[PDB]
Design a protein around this ligand. Structure first.
Ligand SMILES: CC(C)(O)CCn1cc2cc(NC(=O)c3cccc(C(F)(F)F)n3)c(C(C)(C)O)cc2n1
Length: 290
């Protein structure tokens, strides 16, 4: 692929000079995605996300350059799609196809009055996100920030993995001094600085628990604070998955929720070598809707 090279002034124009009012009150600010703020825009009838990046300049410049490198190689119906970018001006900007149902985080939480996702829709989002991670692993990439904030949802609730700024090209276990990820999602070995696709798998399991419960992975004002902990509550038969299923669903049945929870639990083994590879996660999520 290649991408349109936008003037900073063009992207200022399409985002109403990066207007900071929310979309919900007719503004252009949609939310935050990594080390940047992201604005809604129109280029010739095409609705776009413009992500303007604000950590060192050379670090920020590296993640921008990484995102372009990953989006050049990787094109799949379960990955967000870059249209262009802007280096010339002050701020570095990435221009994507708009995702009209925003992030899985926001929908799981029914942000801005959106209705709760059904069990049927959740199953498709899961299969979809796993098809996304699979393409990235097949094309020898490690995301390193799989979380519901980074699974976007299009007009038909198609799951789209996004934010490849930290993605590592990994032919196949390195280790690192700069440890990166969102704690609440990261595996043991990722938090000790190991880099391996097997960490992406753990992180996915957290996202399956988010899907099953509608609980965000961390919540300071909740017990337990870490959704992960609920695995241990369940394995120690203090509670069943039934006690934790999102109550904002009328269409979840025991069999398919347990099926999904079994994947989440397999995904979440503490021993990275006992976890299934994304290919097996696909097989199991596809097997789960018979
Ligand atoms: C009315 C309604 C149902 O509330 C929906 C409103 N809504 C719509 C959104 C679209 C979004 N994102 C994208 O379009 C998008 C597309 C590609 C890439 C990227 C990223 F790389 F910048 F992360 N973001 C967001 C993000 C995820 C950027 O915050 C939030 C939203 N909220």
């Amino acid at each position: 692929t290649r991408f349109h090279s936008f003037s900073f002034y063009e992207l200022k124009n399409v985002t109403n000079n990066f207007d900071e009012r929310p979309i919900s009150v007719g503004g252009n600010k949609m939310g935050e995605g990594g080390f940047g703020v992201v604005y809604k825009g129109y280029v010739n009838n095409t609705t776009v996300a413009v992500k303007k990046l604000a950590i060192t300049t050379e670090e920020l410049k590296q993640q921008f350059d990484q995102e372009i490198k990953v989006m050049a190689k990787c094109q799949h119906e379960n990955l967000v799609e870059l249209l262009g970018f802007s280096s010339d001006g002050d701020d570095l900007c990435l221009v994507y196809v708009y995702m009209p149902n925003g992030s899985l985080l926001d929908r799981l939480s029914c942000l801005d009055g959106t209705p709760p996702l059904s069990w049927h829709m959740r199953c498709k989002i899961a299969q979809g996100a796993a098809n996304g991670i699979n393409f990235l692993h097949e094309n020898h990439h490690i995301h390193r920030d799989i979380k519901s904030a980074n699974i976007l949802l299009d007009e038909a609730f198609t799951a789209k993995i996004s934010d490849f700024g930290l993605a590592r090209a990994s032919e196949k276990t390195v280790m690192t001094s700069r440890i990166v990820g969102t704690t609440a999602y990261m595996a043991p070995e990722a938090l000790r600085g190991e880099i391996t696709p097997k960490s992406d798998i753990y992180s996915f399991g957290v996202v399956l628990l988010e899907i099953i419960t509608g609980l965000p992975a961390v919540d300071e004002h909740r017990e337990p604070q870490l959704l992960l902990d609920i695995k241990e509550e369940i394995e120690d038969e203090e509670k069943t998955i039934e006690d934790y299923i999102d109550k904002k669903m009328n269409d979840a049945d025991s069999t398919s929720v347990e099926a999904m929870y079994s994947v989440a639990s397999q995904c979440l083994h503490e021993k990275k070598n006992k976890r299934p590879d994304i290919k097996k996660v696909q097989q199991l999520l596809q097997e789960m809707t018979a």
